[PDB]
Write a protein that binds this ligand. Structure first.
Ligand code: NAG
Ligand code: NAG
Ligand code: NAG
Ligand code: NAG
Length: 162
């Protein structure tokens, strides 16, 4: 299993993202020898993390020498819901036909919960990013935008955990 890592993003108005989650990139690509391969790359506890705050956009970037993954969270003030709305990936794969590439999708809606509550799920979710890339959220507790007393709000647990 991927390792559960903790994340805290703080900016001008304090903490805007709390997360405890295990993540894995599942990528299908063409190797130099013209063959297709599918590999998993776990987000490592060792990765460098950072992020940014705002009232429309909250980001978390996890990176190392060969890879940078950015999660973008959005929210709808009229509904007071937050959600993962985007994924950006930069990667270098030495054995790929195209070694250095990017994959993105900014039309996502996952990990959705009420603003002021936290999203929690222990059931693996394979989030489609492109035909060739999924973000596997192996387990997660996450909260974006509004954070009170620097801790998770009440849990909204995915139905599948039942
Ligand atoms: C902080 O709050 C102010 C006032 O609510 C808002 O205008 C500003 O965009 C917020 N900044 C961040 C980084 O969330
Ligand atoms: C990917 O690389 C481009 C160009 O260097 C950069 O603008 C972008 O922020 C990078 N994306 C991530 C998620 O680091
Ligand atoms: C934002 O919330 C309002 C109120 O529920 C709704 O009318 C609107 O369609 C929502 N936007 C999106 C993108 O869901
Ligand atoms: C991005 O993800 C959304 C949600 O699954 C999907 O509807 C859309 O087709 C995706 N875009 C691409 C280019 O894969």
């Amino acid at each position: 299993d991927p390792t559960v890592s903790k994340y805290n993003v703080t900016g001008n108005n304090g903490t805007c993202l709390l997360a405890s989650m295990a993540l894995q990139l599942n990528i299908t690509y063409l190797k130099k020898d013209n063959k297709t391969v599918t590999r998993a790359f776990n987000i490592s506890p060792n990765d460098t993390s950072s992020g940014s705050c705002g009232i429309n956009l909250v980001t978390l970037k996890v990176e190392n020498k060969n890879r940078a993954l950015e999660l973008q969270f959005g929210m709808n003030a009229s509904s007071s819901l937050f959600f993962l709305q985007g994924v950006r990936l930069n990667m270098t794969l030495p054995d790929a036909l195209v070694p250095t590439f990017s994959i993105s999708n900014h039309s996502l809606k996952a990990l959705q919960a009420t603003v002021g509550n936290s999203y929690k799920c222990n059931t693996e979710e394979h989030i489609f990013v492109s035909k060739m890339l999924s973000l596997n959220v192996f387990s997660v507790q996450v909260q974006a935008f509004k954070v009170d007393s620097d801790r998770f709000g009440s849990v909204e647990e995915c139905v599948q955990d039942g």
